[PDB]
């Protein structure tokens, strides 16, 4: 499971490489943390996919699709601009005690 299990309200920050959402924290309540998958995300070659990173200077219309579970964008070539549009499940994103963390 994702990050979404236990939070909500998930958004697109920092031009949208960055996730802010709710994450309901053992306390029970809803805090918002933010955490950079243009870190552990990379797409340059029009592909998505974790290992590369700084995706987002490869990828145009940066929007969650699964609310939060599946980030969905259109990977294009630096080379141009061009290329194929695809969709990454971020299910490698998790909140632990309300801190959103990469897992």
């Known amino acids: 499971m994702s990050y979404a299990?236990?939070?909500?309200?998930?958004?697109?920050?920092?031009?949208?490489?960055?996730?802010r959402a709710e994450?309901?924290?053992?306390?029970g309540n809803w805090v918002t943390s933010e955490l950079d998958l243009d870190t552990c995300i990379?797409?340059?070659?029009?592909?998505?996919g974790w290992g590369?990173?700084?995706?987002?200077?490869?990828?145009?219309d940066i929007k969650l699709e699964e609310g939060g579970r599946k980030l969905t964008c259109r990977p294009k070539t630096v080379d141009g601009g061009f290329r194929e549009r695809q969709g990454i499940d971020l299910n490698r994103?998790?909140?632990v005690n309300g801190r959103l963390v990469f897992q």
């Open 42 to 48: 990379g797409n340059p070659n029009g592909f998505l």
């Open 5 to 19: 299990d236990s939070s909500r309200n998930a958004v697109l920050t920092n031009g949208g490489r960055t996730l």
């Open 52 to 60: 590369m990173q700084n995706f987002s200077h490869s990828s145009e």
């Open 93 to 95: 994103i998790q909140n």
């Open 23 to 27: 994450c309901r924290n053992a306390d």
